[PDB]
Amino acid sequence: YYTEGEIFGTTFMYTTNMMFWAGIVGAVAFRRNLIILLLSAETVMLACNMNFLFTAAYLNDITGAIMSITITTIAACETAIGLALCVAYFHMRSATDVEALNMLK
Amino acid sequence: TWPEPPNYYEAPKHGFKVTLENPTFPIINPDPNITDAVTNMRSENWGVVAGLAGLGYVAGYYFGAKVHWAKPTALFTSIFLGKSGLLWGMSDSAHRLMGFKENSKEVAANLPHVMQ
Amino acid sequence: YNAWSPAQRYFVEGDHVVTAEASRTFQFTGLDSGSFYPYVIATVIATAISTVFIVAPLVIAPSRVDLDKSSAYSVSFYLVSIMYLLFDIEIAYLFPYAMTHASLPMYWTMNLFLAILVAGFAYEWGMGALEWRE
Amino acid sequence: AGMGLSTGTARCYDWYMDYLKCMDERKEPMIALRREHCLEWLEDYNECLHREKERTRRQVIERERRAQLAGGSKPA
Amino acid sequence: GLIRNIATFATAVVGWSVGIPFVVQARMNGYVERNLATYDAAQRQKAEEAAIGG
Amino acid sequence: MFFENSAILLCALLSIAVGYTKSPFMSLMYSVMLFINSSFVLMMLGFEFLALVNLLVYVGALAVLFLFVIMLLEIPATELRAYSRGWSTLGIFVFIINGVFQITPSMGPRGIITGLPGAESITNLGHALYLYFADLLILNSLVLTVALFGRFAIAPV
Amino acid sequence: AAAAAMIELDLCFGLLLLILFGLLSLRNGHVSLAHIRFICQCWLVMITPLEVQDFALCILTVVLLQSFHSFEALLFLLLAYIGQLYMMHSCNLVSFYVCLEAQTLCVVVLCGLLARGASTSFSVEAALKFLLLSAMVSGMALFWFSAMYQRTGSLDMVGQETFWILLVMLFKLGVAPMHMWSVDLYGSIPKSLLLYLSTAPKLSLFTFWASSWHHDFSVGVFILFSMFIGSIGAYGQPALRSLFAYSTINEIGLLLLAVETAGFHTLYQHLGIYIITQLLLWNLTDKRLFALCAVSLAGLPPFAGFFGKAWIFWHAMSVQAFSLLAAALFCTLLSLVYYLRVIRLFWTAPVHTAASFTGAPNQTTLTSACAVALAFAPVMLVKPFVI
Amino acid sequence: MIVASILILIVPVLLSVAMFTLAERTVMASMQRRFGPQVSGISGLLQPFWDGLKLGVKEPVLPDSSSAGAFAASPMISFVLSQVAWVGICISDASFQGLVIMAISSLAVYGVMLAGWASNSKYAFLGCLRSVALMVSYELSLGAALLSIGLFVTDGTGMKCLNFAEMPTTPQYAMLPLCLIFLVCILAETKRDPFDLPGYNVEYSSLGFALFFIAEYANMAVMSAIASIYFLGGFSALKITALFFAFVWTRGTLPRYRYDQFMRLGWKAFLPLTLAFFALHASVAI
Amino acid sequence: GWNALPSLVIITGIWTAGLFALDKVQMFRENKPAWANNKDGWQKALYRRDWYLQREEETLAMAK
Ligand SMILES: CCCCCCCCCCCCCCCCCC(=O)O[C@@H](COC(=O)CCCCCCCCCCCCCCC)COP(=O)(O)OC[C@H](O)CO
Numbered sequence A: 001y002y003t004e005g006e007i008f009g010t011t012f013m014y015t016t017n018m019m020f021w022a023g024i025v026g027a028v029a030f031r032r033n034l035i036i037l038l039l040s041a042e043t044v045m046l047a048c049n050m051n052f053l054f055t056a057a058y059l060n061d062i063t064g065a066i067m068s069i070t071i072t073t074i075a076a077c078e079t080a081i082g083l084a085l086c087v088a089y090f091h092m093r094s095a096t097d098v099e100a101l102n103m104l105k
Numbered sequence B: 001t002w003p004e005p006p007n008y009y010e011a012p013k014h015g016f017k018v019t020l021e022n023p024t025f026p027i028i029n030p031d032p033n034i035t036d037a038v039t040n041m042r043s044e045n046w047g048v049v050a051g052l053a054g055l056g057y058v059a060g061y062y063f064g065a066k067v068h069w070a071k072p073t074a075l076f077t078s079i080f081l082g083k084s085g086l087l088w089g090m091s092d093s094a095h096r097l098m099g100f101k102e103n104s105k106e107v108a109a110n111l112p113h114v115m116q
Numbered sequence C: 001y002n003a004w005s006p007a008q009r010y011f012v013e014g015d016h017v018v019t020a021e022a023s024r025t026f027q028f029t030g031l032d033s034g035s036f037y038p039y040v041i042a043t044v045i046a047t048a049i050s051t052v053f054i055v056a057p058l059v060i061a062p063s064r065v066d067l068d069k070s071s072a073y074s075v076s077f078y079l080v081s082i083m084y085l086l087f088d089i090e091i092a093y094l095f096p097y098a099m100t101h102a103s104l105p106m107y108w109t110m111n112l113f114l115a116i117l118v119a120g121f122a123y124e125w126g127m128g129a130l131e132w133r134e
Numbered sequence D: 001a002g003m004g005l006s007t008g009t010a011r012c013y014d015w016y017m018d019y020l021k022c023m024d025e026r027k028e029p030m031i032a033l034r035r036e037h038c039l040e041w042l043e044d045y046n047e048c049l050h051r052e053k054e055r056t057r058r059q060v061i062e063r064e065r066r067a068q069l070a071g072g073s074k075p076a
Numbered sequence E: 001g002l003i004r005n006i007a008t009f010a011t012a013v014v015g016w017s018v019g020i021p022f023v024v025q026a027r028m029n030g031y032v033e034r035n036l037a038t039y040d041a042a043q044r045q046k047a048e049e050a051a052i053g054g
Numbered sequence F: 001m002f003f004e005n006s007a008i009l010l011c012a013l014l015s016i017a018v019g020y021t022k023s024p025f026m027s028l029m030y031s032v033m034l035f036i037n038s039s040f041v042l043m044m045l046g047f048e049f050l051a052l053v054n055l056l057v058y059v060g061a062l063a064v065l066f067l068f069v070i071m072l073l074e075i076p077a078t079e080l081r082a083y084s085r086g087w088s089t090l091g092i093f094v095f096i097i098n099g100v101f102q103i104t105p106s107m108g109p110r111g112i113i114t115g116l117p118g119a120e121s122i123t124n125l126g127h128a129l130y131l132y133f134a135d136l137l138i139l140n141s142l143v144l145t146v147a148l149f150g151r152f153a154i155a156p157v
Numbered sequence G: 001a002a003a004a005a006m007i008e009l010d011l012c013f014g015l016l017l018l019i020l021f022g023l024l025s026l027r028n029g030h031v032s033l034a035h036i037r038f039i040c041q042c043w044l045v046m047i048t049p050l051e052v053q054d055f056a057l058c059i060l061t062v063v064l065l066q067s068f069h070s071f072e073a074l075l076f077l078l079l080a081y082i083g084q085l086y087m088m089h090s091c092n093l094v095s096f097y098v099c100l101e102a103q104t105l106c107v108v109v110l111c112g113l114l115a116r117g118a119s120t121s122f123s124v125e126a127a128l129k130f131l132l133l134s135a136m137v138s139g140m141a142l143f144w145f146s147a148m149y150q151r152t153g154s155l156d157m158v159g160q161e162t163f164w165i166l167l168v169m170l171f172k173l174g175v176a177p178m179h180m181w182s183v184d185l186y187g188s189i190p191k192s193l194l195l196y197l198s199t200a201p202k203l204s205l206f207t208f209w210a211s212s213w214h215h216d217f218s219v220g221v222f223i224l225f226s227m228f229i230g231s232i233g234a235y236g237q238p239a240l241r242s243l244f245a246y247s248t249i250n251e252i253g254l255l256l257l258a259v260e261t262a263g264f265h266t267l268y269q270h271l272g273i274y275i276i277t278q279l280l281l282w283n284l285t286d287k288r289l290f291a292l293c294a295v296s297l298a299g300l301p302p303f304a305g306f307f308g309k310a311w312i313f314w315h316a317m318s319v320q321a322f323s324l325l326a327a328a329l330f331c332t333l334l335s336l337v338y339y340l341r342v343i344r345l346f347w348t349a350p351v352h353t354a355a356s357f358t359g360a361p362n363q364t365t366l367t368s369a370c371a372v373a374l375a376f377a378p379v380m381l382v383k384p385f386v387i
Numbered sequence H: 001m002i003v004a005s006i007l008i009l010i011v012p013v014l015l016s017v018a019m020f021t022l023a024e025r026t027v028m029a030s031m032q033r034r035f036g037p038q039v040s041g042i043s044g045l046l047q048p049f050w051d052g053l054k055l056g057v058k059e060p061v062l063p064d065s066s067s068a069g070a071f072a073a074s075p076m077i078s079f080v081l082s083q084v085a086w087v088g089i090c091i092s093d094a095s096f097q098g099l100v101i102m103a104i105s106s107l108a109v110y111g112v113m114l115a116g117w118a119s120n121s122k123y124a125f126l127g128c129l130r131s132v133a134l135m136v137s138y139e140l141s142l143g144a145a146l147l148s149i150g151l152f153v154t155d156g157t158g159m160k161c162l163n164f165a166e167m168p169t170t171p172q173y174a175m176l177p178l179c180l181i182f183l184v185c186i187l188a189e190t191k192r193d194p195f196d197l198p199g200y201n202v203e204y205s206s207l208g209f210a211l212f213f214i215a216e217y218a219n220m221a222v223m224s225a226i227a228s229i230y231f232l233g234g235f236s237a238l239k240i241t242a243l244f245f246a247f248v249w250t251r252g253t254l255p256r257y258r259y260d261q262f263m264r265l266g267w268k269a270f271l272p273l274t275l276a277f278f279a280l281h282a283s284v285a286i
Numbered sequence I: 001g002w003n004a005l006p007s008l009v010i011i012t013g014i015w016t017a018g019l020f021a022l023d024k025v026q027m028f029r030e031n032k033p034a035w036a037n038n039k040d041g042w043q044k045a046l047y048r049r050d051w052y053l054q055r056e057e058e059t060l061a062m063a064k
């Protein structure tokens, strides 16, 4: 009924959908730290970047590659600022919290 | 199917902002350079450049005197506003040369052998 | 990977092409141009070799249990790591420029890009942030 | 924004331009009213994009091929 | 232990590599079946409209 | 095509594994494996340069910052209720519903797509970045400027 | 030809010169930077086009810069203004995403930078929560943009995926029940950033909505949630920062009622009156004028807030949006009680206003006294003015 | 055939690493008016092999306070990355080969940082961050140098690339200062003199330690081949030996920098110079 | 010194012999001394067409 290319494409799309929801939900579900939350946000960005690159190949179009570069730039900038804020908050509140970087406890 | 043989040495002639107009006035130069833009600039453009520079000097002198640094602040503020005015004037002159604005003064001055 | 359609096989019919593709030798001048497949095999082979290096002294070496043998004998890094991240992104942006035969407006756009880069860098230089005294 | 990845334009750029040209040449005061008169070009553009009807035809031929081999296994 | 963790990771990777393609295959089979039902309903509507539309 | 499809499906396993484990170090190791594997997945689509950008930025630069922050800020508290409190069943239900069964997929009504490899041209990318999307390039530069200045202003003194 | 892009080159050249001037001024040990602020305001005027909304944003940001004092804060506000201006001209989801993300990063960094005293860690905490909540909304925007791009093959914003983009826009306005990031921000972050956050991004995003957005859906349940939650929350929260956060949620519910029934003229009138009231609210030193904000945010008749609410009510009744209108009228009746609590707190009390000691004597009496003359704007508001 | 080609590549890499470490000892001795290893085999030609076999029958110390997996994984990761980078040099035809090797060498930071995290030493954690800071700081100058190199690399069809077979077979006389900066960047990446202040393998014994040093010398050979391809007009045996002799010669005659000193050097001297040279070469290339 | 000469000679000989052997092996795999050249999309298309047409010529040869 369907070919090997159709299996490959549907497998890619199913994988990226589960990747997106894993990055959105999982670290919050497992009650993890802000550092792991930022890592999972990077997983969300990776899923969107893979989707854009797949579509850019699928349509023979340039816009997915432009979006890929932009996503990498924005994600790294936001992650760096978030980690700096995490370090500052940890040094401000560790004298009375111990588990200061975990707000899901 | 078989793609076009790529031309690596030819880049597309494209500016990132596209005007989406046809010019409604006679075209003297479809693509003027900076020398062409300055040498056909009107006197009102130079007047607004000098007015912006003077206003910048006075305001920079006022604001730079609160930290006792009035003269370099005045010089910097004058240059800052003056280059804003100069970019405005050069753009206006280039648009008149390309035909997107009225250029009756410019057609009777930029074509010495094509005057009449 | 093997081609799964007649259009992917240049409309060559038969069963000899399907078996010949599935049992082909790797060739950069055949069907596998620019392939990056030797990079995976190199990883597998080198991981095998280093695992054999790890495991072997657990067999052919003497060993004695001791409780003392199994015992231990700044913010500038944040600056370096974050600055390296941003500068690596900027160099990755500059790489598609250098791989093209650029015209003059491309050159001036690239120089505006570099100017914004070096202006932020020169501000951090002038405020004494690249003096690693702490 | 319609530039190709390895070619000059995308592979379904001209179908999109046909659709936008149809939308340009109508005179109805609403886009939703103009869309009802250009549905053939939008359908051809969608068929360029995803080939849903070619895939449907191949699925129907495969259903008939699987039917002519299970219900029909006639020996010589 | 280290050997237990390596064995558990290998088991999880192999089980994921064999089990998920069955989920994807079932999903694609359901989509094919629903598409064929849609094709048959469209053909039925076309025959009805040809019958009472001249 | 068993190994290629398995390599595609491994990314979702590593995405779950990042949050599943209790060790922050192991979470980062799972993320590094995921980004390397995804860079190899992107090269199945024909992208050579953008896969290398993925590797160089995320694994080379950002994960080093993650490992420095984790190694500087994480005294072991995996016993300290990271194991003794467990996880959220509502969040796991949301993940199952939205990412396993996928009641709201990105393809919408479509359920089958043909995956097609591309042929990345870096001349086309250079032309696009420096002629057609030049304003977006400059605004990306401005975002990087915000990152540099903002970090150096927010650095704890 | 690049002759149609001199304003962009002027923007970039001005940023390049301003960074170098700020560096040279700091090498002299100048503890004040009014010259840098004047150059920033000149740069703001020089890059703004000749539309009504663009100049409204420009003049608003020129007024806002008088409450900021460091060089880095001025740079972050300028680079947030670039995103705020260019979002109004965005006709795709590419530029939409980049402008929104630039604004989010600037706001996060400013929340980290400007906190002082015992409230530093509270501000950093609320900035971290805002960044984490913003990251997943940005991921939702990217994911559904990728879905739309795959389905249509183009950059048109049509189809079912626009519902999630609409939810992204509703998050950026603090619409209930996605409202709690703003409630967290109001309780800890200082007053100047609260003044910035309640005025400029709402104007930028609503202008993008007016200019280039269509969806086939509704926002009515979020109108109901915003109005009821904001009114009841401001009735129940004794801290004044939380009172004003919840009253802001109520006001954004009214603006969404104006959006939902079309008629953007009432939206623009109410938004302008609200922005002027915000400019008065966060710069008050005499507490008697806190009562004028109260009577003009309760919709009491002769003041300008009445007119801003009443054209929204008129256009809603014109197109017969009866149920949402009835809910809006009930929440308006509830809002009066806590605005009367404000009047009880700050009008029926003895007057004490401390003098300045280290100069700068009551430094924003000009703007606050100018914005109190919203009792004279109603003569122009009654006419067909905003259309 | 790919597995055969990779193993036939792997054999001279390890043989060459053994002979490099012997030749470093003996050349360093000859500069210091002595002999170096001569007893162990005729002309000392068995000394690296007996070092390897001695470490083979040496007891592996596994500290029972560390994480065993990352402790084992760090030298394996270093060795694997060195071998993969050599395969990218010789068994590839990719369009962006220099970018591939730059990406691989950017991954080599992980072995140092995993050794720093795994072992429970106070100053291993202190020195791993310094070594990573040094490698991270000089990677940017290496990348900007690659940008300057790639502006002039075009194949026959007219496409610009970083393919090694398309590089010219004459020395690049126009880029002598960039070549010198590249060589000092190679010295900084391999933690040699004058950047050898940071060690991280203080807890490793036997073949994990041997894997660390094989990876270090193989990475040195990778960077030597890369410099000979980019600046010296090709990859050859004589050029590999001459550049190795130059590195040992510099190690014989110079003292080392302090940490902040080479940080200021890499962030105030080498990066602005490579960026300015990139701008000048881009102006030339128009 | 004279003691440093044998190791330095051996490094050169090792790399010469190894590169010669690797060259012969990869030449046997690829059968043309330009296998390591850069290839764009047109050259990749040409090689893939050549491979498939060679297979077709082999298929048609075993029928006469
Ligand atoms: C202290 C500051 C003072 C500033 C003022 C003085 C300095 C002079 C101003 C700079 C030069 C003049 C402005 C630009 C001139 C463009 C006019 C033009 O046509 O010139 C050339 C146009 O080429 C350029 O230099 C183009 C510049 C491109 C700039 C691209 C970036 C624009 C800005 C993007 C910012 C994005 C927005 C950010 C916020 C979202 C080529 O001339 P031609 O067509 O006659 O020659 C033909 C030849 O074959 C080459 O084409």
Ligand SMILES: COC1=C(OC)C(=O)C(C/C=C(\C)CC/C=C(\C)CC/C=C(\C)CC/C=C(\C)CCC=C(C)C)=C(C)C1=O
Pocket: H014, H015, H017, H018, H021, H022, H024, H025, H047, H048, H049, H051, H052, H210, H213, H214
């Ligand atoms: C001053 O600098 C130096 C050091 O300080 C940084 C050192 O530490 C060492 C000592 C350390 C060494 C030599 C270890 C690294 C090298 C190794 C293990 C050699 C690798 C060689 C291999 C794999 C080939 C040998 C194996 C063979 C031939 C197989 C045999 C098989 C059979 C007989 C069946 C040296 C010499 C040195 O100069």
